[PDB]
Design a protein around this ligand. Structure first.
Ligand code: SAM
Ligand code: ZN
Ligand code: ZN
Ligand code: ZN
Length: 428
């Protein structure tokens, strides 16, 4: 709470303000999760209650699909696991609510259980969340209804559903204020709601970073903050040019960024770096390849749900072949396809393929992103772990050290993830 304040940020609604100075790597505040969910694919790898990544995980006898550190965690998570335990077994293979429906069901359960202001709502309350209901078109309003139907379909037993479709308000609120809990390699662990953290506005030049210590959100300065200065995070991936960033912010958050980077368009020429080839491309040759680039990102986005790894790798190489003609290999659109391919090799357990892609990525990655970037820290981590795994321990230790350098600021020097990497350098 201390040394910070809620205020009306002009043309940004409510926001967070500093009342004291903050230095690079300082914890402004922590926020316990108000409501949270462990992602289906991480069940058994982490405790459902505290999110501890351990090996001696005790399975829920009643459903065989919830794992905990012990019985104390099992007991504590029951008021929330109660919502899914029996349904999972009764519906079996037919149990498929989206993580949004899963999280929203828990928000409804927390309101029944704890109607009072929670210690997660010191400055902002879930009830007070911005919905953007008024800007929702007929397509978006319909998607919320598909999700309201699922909430009724699967969580009808223990929940008393509110008013009309003032559930449309709750779903829109989660869509606009919800959080994704990622791991040290930026892999999806789950979804949560953090009220006080949701008060911070967006900047493509963030002065803070949100990291997670179990289910607790921690906010640390990645730039020096002086009194009266507004505290800003990044809502989106900062690799992309101004237009791309702004299309994402408009679609998901109903606003346009007017920050230094968006006003100036500084990193745009380097991000979409054109080959300095004998006879230039032409204005329309760039614009046609950028239209092709965006299309292939989205085509791969779709494809990955239904194509084989080799089919998926072919898309990467053939996209990079067509674009190679116009675009430099440092070009963000080239980097995207290389990252995707690295991801495919990792899945196939092709460690050399993944390492040979990661090396091509890291240098332009560091350049296109800010100084302390989780995107670059995790890329150093994947590289260090690929090196260490393949027995190239010199290069592994250097890449792992590079990761730790960023993490000491973003995660804090005393973070479990950092003690884990240090123990990776000690043994192997
Ligand atoms: C997670 S909330 C942040 C707190 C918020 N302004 C409020 O008072 O509820 C997200 C919403 O805040 C606004 N917002 C965040 N960053 C912004 C920015 N840089 N410029 C304009 N509006 C912004 C948009 O309405 C966005 O959808
Ligand atoms: Zn636990
Ligand atoms: Zn169970
Ligand atoms: Zn911006």
């Amino acid at each position: 709470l201390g040394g910070l304040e809620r205020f009306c940020s002009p043309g940004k609604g409510r926001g967070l303000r500093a009342l004291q100075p903050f230095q690079v790597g300082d914890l402004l505040f922590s926020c316990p999760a108000y409501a949270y969910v462990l992602t289906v694919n991480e069940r058994g790898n982490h405790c459902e209650y505290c999110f501890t990544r351990k090996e001696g995980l005790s399975k829920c006898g009643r459903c065989k699909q919830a794992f905990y550190c012990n019985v104390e965690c099992q007991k504590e998570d029951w008021p929330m696991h109660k919502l899914e335990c029996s349904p999972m077994v009764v519906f079996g293979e037919n149990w498929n609510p989206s993580e949004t429906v899963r999280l929203t069901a828990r928000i409804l359960a927390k309101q029944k259980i704890h109607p009072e202001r929670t210690p997660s709502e010191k400055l902002l309350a879930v009830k007070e969340f911005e919905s953007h209901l008024d800007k929702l078109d007929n397509e978006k309003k319909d998607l919320i209804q598909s999700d309201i139907a699922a909430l009724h379909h699967f969580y009808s037993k223990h929940l008393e559903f509110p008013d009309n479709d003032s559930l449309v308000v709750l779903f829109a609120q989660v869509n606009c204020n919800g959080f994704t809990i990622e791991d040290e390699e930026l892999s999806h662990l789950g979804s949560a709601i953090f009220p006080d953290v949701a008060l911070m506005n967006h900047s493509c030049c963030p002065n803070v970073i949100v990291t997670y210590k179990g289910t607790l959100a921690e906010v640390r300065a990645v730039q020096e903050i002086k009194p009266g200065e507004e505290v800003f995070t990044s809502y989106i991936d900062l690799l992309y040019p101004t237009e791309d960033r702004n299309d994402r912010l408009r679609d998901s958050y109903f606003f346009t960024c007017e920050c230094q980077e968006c006003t100036t368009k500084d990193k745009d020429k380097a991000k979409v770096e054109i080959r300095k080839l004998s006879d230039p491309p032409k204005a329309e040759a760039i614009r046609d390849m950028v239209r092709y680039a965006r299309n292939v990102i989205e085509e791969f986005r779709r494809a990955k749900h239904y194509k084989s790894p080799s089919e998926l790798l072919e898309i990467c190489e053939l996209s990079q072949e067509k674009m190679s003609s116009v675009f430099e290999d440092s070009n963000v659109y080239m980097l995207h396809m290389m990252y995707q391919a690295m991801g495919v090799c990792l899945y196939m357990q092709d460690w050399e393929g993944a390492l040979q892609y990661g090396q091509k990525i890291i240098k332009p990655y560091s350049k296109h992103y800010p100084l302390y970037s989780l995107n670059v820290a995790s890329m150093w981590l994947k590289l260090g772990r690929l090196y260490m795994g393949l027995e190239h321990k010199a290069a592994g230790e250097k890449a792992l050290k590079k990761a730790i350098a960023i993490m000491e600021v973003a995660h804090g020097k005393d973070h479990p993830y950092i003690s884990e990497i240090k123990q990776e350098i000690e043994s192997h």
